[PDB]
Design a protein around this ligand. Structure first.
Ligand SMILES: [Co+2]
Ligand SMILES: [Co+2]
Lengths: 209, 212
């Protein structure tokens, strides 16, 4: 099995620095070229840098020239990407990939450049009345990601977890609901599992009618 | 080198034929690839060197060339193919991607079922009240959601959010959230949400009164 995993990344103050690592399994990076490709949320993919680990030659992009640095360590089979003077423009999901067409990618890491401090979410219940609907309200939080599951993963049908929406406070919010029969309201218990890693906040809320 | 992709948006039914064109500003030779990307996720290689199918993807996808015009064609469409498709050249650094082509699965009109959620008692203690309107498994995406606090049409205090097309019934779901200060929320009784949709003969209104 061959895979790539990226680590590092998160909330960064503008002008700050942050380093990303992409580790490789199932192949040697010295045999191929390693690419870093980023994508701002819903904005398309923009190539950043490339390295050929066996010789160390590094090719960058003009939108990153100077303040970014991409390196490799052929002994540890991981490639690196050091980013200085980070700007809000640099906020994106940063991917890692190999060559010659780029075939196998990584899940990516979130690099957020903002002056907003990390804030955990407040979780509120959306209860049904009188099929019936119920859900949870993930209130002001920063930065993303946020995992929402239902009944620790048991409830999966009829669930709709909406994307984040930026609020006027500069913080995010989202709602997650589920379509359930009205007969199940009294008998069955519904709990949503909210997971915000950046603030290390884990809240499970029992939605009661 | 700049790559240009047409059409930027697309909406074709299951089993239809889809063709996506990618213009090269300069010579890129056959050094192009076609990718597919689900929401978030990671791009998946589809075609390499403008013609060759990747090992693992069905032969429904195909790629061809007409000079600097590279077209990816889908013979038979499936509802599992809602994604954005990219074309990338690798002749010269920097490798340039296309602008993206979001394809949507087309289906029959389905009216939305509507629910309204009063603010929670926990949020009221915080000092903010949020009223949520939920539009359930509808098509097409186009919908109008309006709020009427005490029969007064609101403006600019609502935020909306829509899910991606469902992988089962090819429907979208929408959430409209009305965020007010707890003080104003404790000022008015009748909170209503009005939905107009192509599948609704008349605009449905779901509402609640404080103190229910
Ligand atoms: Co649903
Ligand atoms: Co040029």
């Amino acid at each position: 099995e061959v895979q790539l995993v990226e680590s590092g990344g998160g909330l960064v103050q503008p002008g700050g620095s942050l380093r990303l690592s992409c580790a490789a399994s199932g192949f040697n990076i010295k045999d191929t070229y390693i690419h870093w490709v980023r994508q701002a949320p819903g904005k398309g993919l923009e190539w950043v840098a490339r390295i050929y680990p066996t010789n160390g030659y590094t090719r960058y992009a003009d939108s990153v020239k100077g303040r970014f640095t991409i390196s490799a360590d052929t002994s540890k089979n991981t490639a690196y990407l050091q980013m200085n003077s980070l700007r809000a423009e640099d906020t994106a999901v940063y991917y890692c990939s190999r060559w010659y067409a780029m075939d196998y990618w990584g899940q990516g890491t979130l690099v957020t450049v903002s002056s907003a401090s990390t804030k955990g979410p407040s979780v509120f219940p959306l209860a049904p009345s009188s099929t019936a609907a119920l859900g949870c309200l993930v209130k002001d939080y920063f930065p993303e990601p946020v995992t929402v599951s239902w009944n620790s993963g048991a409830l999966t049908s009829g669930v709709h977890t909406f994307p984040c929406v930026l609020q006027s406070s500069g913080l995010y919010s989202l709602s997650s609901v589920v379509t359930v029969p009205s007969s199940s309201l009294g008998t069955q218990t519904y709990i949503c599992n909210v997971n915000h890693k950046p603030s290390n906040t884990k809240v499970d809320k029992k939605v009661e009618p | 080198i700049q790559m240009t992709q047409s059409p930027s948006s697309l909406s074709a039914s299951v089993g239809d034929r889809v063709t996506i064109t990618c213009r090269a500003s300069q010579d890129v030779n056959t050094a192009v690839a076609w990718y597919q990307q689900k929401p978030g996720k990671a791009p998946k290689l589809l075609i390499y060197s403008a013609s060759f199918l990747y090992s693992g993807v069905p032969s429904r996808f195909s790629g061809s060339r007409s000079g600097t015009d590279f077209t990816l064609t889908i013979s038979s469409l499936q509802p599992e193919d809602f994604a954005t498709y990219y074309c990338q050249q690798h002749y010269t650094t920097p490798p340039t991607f296309g602008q993206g082509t979001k394809v949507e699965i087309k289906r029959t009109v389905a009216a939305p079922s509507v629910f309204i959620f009063p603010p929670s008692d926990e949020q009221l203690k915080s000092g903010t009240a949020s009223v949520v309107c939920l539009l359930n498994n509808f098509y097409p995406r186009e919908a109008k959601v309006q709020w009427k606090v005490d029969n007064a049409l609101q403006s600019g205090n609502s935020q909306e959010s829509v899910t991606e097309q469902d992988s089962k019934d090819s429907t979208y779901s929408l959430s409209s959230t009305l965020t007010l200060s707890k003080a104003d929320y404790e000022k008015h009784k009748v909170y209503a949400c009005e939905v107009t949709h192509q599948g609704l003969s008349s605009p449905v209104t779901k509402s609640f009164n404080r103190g229910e």
